[PDB]
Scaffold this active site. Structure first.
Site, mmCIF file in Angstrom:
data_model
loop_
_atom_site.group_PDB
_atom_site.id
_atom_site.type_symbol
_atom_site.label_atom_id
_atom_site.label_comp_id
_atom_site.label_asym_id
_atom_site.label_seq_id
_atom_site.Cartn_x
_atom_site.Cartn_y
_atom_site.Cartn_z
ATOM 1 C CB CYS A 1 2.584 1.540 7.630
ATOM 2 S SG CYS A 1 0.716 1.639 7.943
ATOM 3 C CG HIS B 1 -0.477 0.232 2.652
ATOM 4 N ND1 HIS B 1 -0.428 1.509 2.896
ATOM 5 C CD2 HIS B 1 -0.487 -0.705 3.336
ATOM 6 C CE1 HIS B 1 0.013 1.347 4.260
ATOM 7 N NE2 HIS B 1 -0.134 -0.191 4.731
ATOM 8 N N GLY C 1 2.213 6.428 10.168
ATOM 9 C CA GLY C 1 3.458 6.389 9.826
ATOM 10 C C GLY C 1 4.452 4.921 10.284
HETATM 11 C C1 RPZ Z 1 -7.335 3.850 11.009
HETATM 12 N N1 RPZ Z 1 -7.455 3.859 9.544
HETATM 13 C C2 RPZ Z 1 -7.561 4.982 8.917
HETATM 14 O O1 RPZ Z 1 -7.496 6.236 9.332
HETATM 15 C C3 RPZ Z 1 -7.310 4.959 7.248
HETATM 16 N N2 RPZ Z 1 -6.354 3.849 7.071
HETATM 17 C C4 RPZ Z 1 -6.991 2.909 5.876
HETATM 18 C C5 RPZ Z 1 -6.068 1.719 5.697
HETATM 19 C C6 RPZ Z 1 -6.690 0.727 5.150
HETATM 20 C C7 RPZ Z 1 -6.099 -0.554 4.829
HETATM 21 C C8 RPZ Z 1 -4.694 -0.466 5.012
HETATM 22 CL CL1 RPZ Z 1 -3.696 -1.745 4.750
HETATM 23 C C9 RPZ Z 1 -3.996 0.633 5.356
HETATM 24 C C10 RPZ Z 1 -4.750 1.852 5.905
HETATM 25 C C11 RPZ Z 1 -4.059 2.852 6.835
HETATM 26 C C12 RPZ Z 1 -2.538 3.108 6.477
HETATM 27 C C13 RPZ Z 1 -2.075 3.487 7.821
HETATM 28 N N3 RPZ Z 1 -3.070 3.097 8.757
HETATM 29 C C14 RPZ Z 1 -2.498 2.875 10.057
HETATM 30 C C15 RPZ Z 1 -1.848 1.718 10.656
HETATM 31 N N4 RPZ Z 1 -1.578 1.447 11.740
HETATM 32 C C16 RPZ Z 1 -1.554 2.712 12.694
HETATM 33 C C17 RPZ Z 1 -2.371 3.666 12.569
HETATM 34 C C18 RPZ Z 1 -3.014 4.758 13.394
HETATM 35 C C19 RPZ Z 1 -3.617 5.706 12.954
HETATM 36 C C20 RPZ Z 1 -3.901 5.971 11.621
HETATM 37 C C21 RPZ Z 1 -3.895 5.242 10.826
HETATM 38 C C22 RPZ Z 1 -2.896 3.870 11.231
HETATM 39 C C23 RPZ Z 1 -4.102 2.559 8.181
HETATM 40 O O2 RPZ Z 1 -5.023 1.854 8.851
HETATM 41 C C24 RPZ Z 1 -5.074 4.168 6.586
#
Ligand code: RPZ
Ligand code: RPZ
Ligand code: CL
Lengths: 305, 296
Positions: A145, A41, A143
């Protein structure tokens, strides 16, 4: 004496963390030999996340579209491929700090250390377990990930987890290092939620044996139980079913303390029914399920107090 | 999201751990530049030390033997001058911490690191660690930017299972001595400023069930806190909690009234950040660092 949630020393993993940037997205990558592993991603925008066609997004990329940074040095990308939900970036330089390693896929109930990173820079280390619903209760911010989960056995680092996303309840989902997700999750912004979570029974039992090893026996009783009767009661408290495999694995701790697995099961049954009544077990007012039988043997003494 | 007891990455400290053997005793040492620091009990320590020669001390760094060329004592720490400077020596300082402050411990056996955990210097100067025989010389540290601040060296275990040690200049934390004698940890207290910081962390993570419309004076809070074996909360603690008060919009004395209600009425089947007890081993700075993403 003492019993703490202990993580493996993170040094061997710190020497592998790099920063991966693709367009506007920046996350962490694991640099092992001449390959950098990171979530696929990184090629996505926020809009793409709804229904991303990774194959179509990746075909539009060249090597120089990926910026890899190891400390203050830029690594040159010379190849790229996708393996499930992980992107593998072939780089020009092999990592001189590459440890002895394996990629392992763990089962729920298994524990591991997580080295949480931001911009390819490690910020903290913590211990956690793969929950029965395939999520991890981690501490991850945007950040993080590409942060990795691992165990260290002798001098070998076993990579078992790469962080990909956070679910609406605050829990985290990710893949093994071959890009296969743990659980029914997709790297897509879909309506997905963690299944109902359960307590890892074999781990709670292991931690009760650790309390007995450290000199705490207040919770023991004169009762025993059949494995079936234990599971009927355990299911009522959202505890995972205890299998014969779990009983076999608890053998060494049963022999060391002299308390049969089904007698320790009778204590757990009573603990669930009664609560702790102002008492603690190893400084905890809750029944702890993130220490495996192998973790207890590793951390605790070979001599019972 | 999520709130875990997090330790600093241990890599810069792992590259300093060595095995020290003197006769029958084998413990851990910290190799920084051309000096190895370890507990002096590896050997009347002035009379015991005068009888030892450099070659009596066996120092092992991985599979290589380091040759001891000098030795001296500084309080309860032995400093062994070695022939080789550690090529993995990081930027470092020796700091003495105060009770309530937290640090990471890299637990070692035979000069080999086995685990890392986070803990706090208790008000009674002990640490509730996880140490077995052979762990002596294991170190406690914090990292700030690229500099490792060494603050603790493990020496001994007390009869209640708690641990006691020194700063890296050999001065013990607490009224302890390095010898076999009748010594016990004093009555412990809860680190109030730390519990408050962790309540702010729960609010940041979306847990507000414990909040109320009430406030309290600092004096009335301390009269109640003193009754539950909680450390007195000072004006300095209130000032240090300022950023968390501004971020959540909950005044420190407002959060103190929530703690007062938790102390008098309990949690009532409810938990805070997955805990049924009030957690005191996260400082206000730990809460800010974990909820911001500070890297090293
Ligand atoms: C909480 N999710 C979102 O706000 C949107 N997010 C959709 C989404 C959908 C699928 C995939 Cl594989 C990645 C992602 C994101 C990429 C980054 N990410 C995150 C990862 N770890 C911790 C986090 C803590 C706070 C905010 C984001 C975090 C996600 O969930 C982004
Ligand atoms: C529990 N202590 C004892 O039985 C006797 N101890 C006297 C003694 C006297 C002075 C000094 Cl400076 C050290 C010490 C010992 C040396 C090692 N050590 C220990 C440290 N950590 C964890 C341990 C776990 C189990 C057993 C010993 C442990 C001690 O306290 C030993
Ligand atoms: Cl497994």
């Amino acid at each position: 004496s003492g019993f703490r949630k202990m993580a493996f020393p993170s040094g061997k993993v710190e020497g592998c963390m790099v920063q991966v940037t693709c367009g506007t997205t920046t996350l962490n990558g694991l640099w092992l030999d001449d390959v950098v592993y990171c979530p696929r991603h990184v090629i996505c925008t926020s809009e793409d996340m709804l229904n991303p066609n990774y194959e179509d997004l990746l075909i539009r990329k060249s090597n120089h579209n990926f910026l890899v940074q190891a400390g203050n040095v830029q690594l040159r990308v010379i190849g790229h491929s996708m393996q499930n939900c992980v992107l593998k970036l072939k780089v020009d330089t092999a990592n001189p700090k590459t440890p002895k390693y394996k990629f392992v896929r763990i089962q729920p109930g298994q524990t591991f250390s997580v080295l949480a990173c931001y911009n390819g820079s490690p910020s903290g280390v913590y211990q956690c377990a793969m929950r029965p619903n395939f999520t991890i209760k981690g501490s991850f911010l945007n950040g993080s990930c590409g942060s990795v989960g691992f165990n260290i056995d002798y001098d070998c680092v076993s990579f078992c987890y790469m962080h990909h996303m956070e679910l609406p309840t605050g829990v985290h989902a990710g893949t093994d290092l071959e890009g296969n997700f743990y659980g029914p999750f997709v790297d897509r912004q879909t309506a997905q939620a963690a299944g109902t979570d359960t307590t890892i029974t074999v781990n709670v039992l292991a931690w009760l044996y650790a309390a007995v090893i450290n000199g705490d026996r207040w919770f023991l009783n004169r009762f025993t139980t059949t494995l079936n009767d234990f599971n009927l009661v355990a299911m009522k408290y959202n505890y995972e079913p205890l299998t014969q495999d779990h009983v076999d694995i608890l053998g060494p701790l049963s022999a060391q303390t002299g308390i049969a697995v089904l007698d320790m099961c009778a204590s757990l049954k009573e603990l669930l029914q009664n609560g702790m009544n102002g008492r603690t077990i190893l400084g905890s007012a809750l029944l702890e399920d993130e220490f495996t039988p192998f973790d207890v043997v590793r951390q605790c003494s070979g001599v019972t107090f």
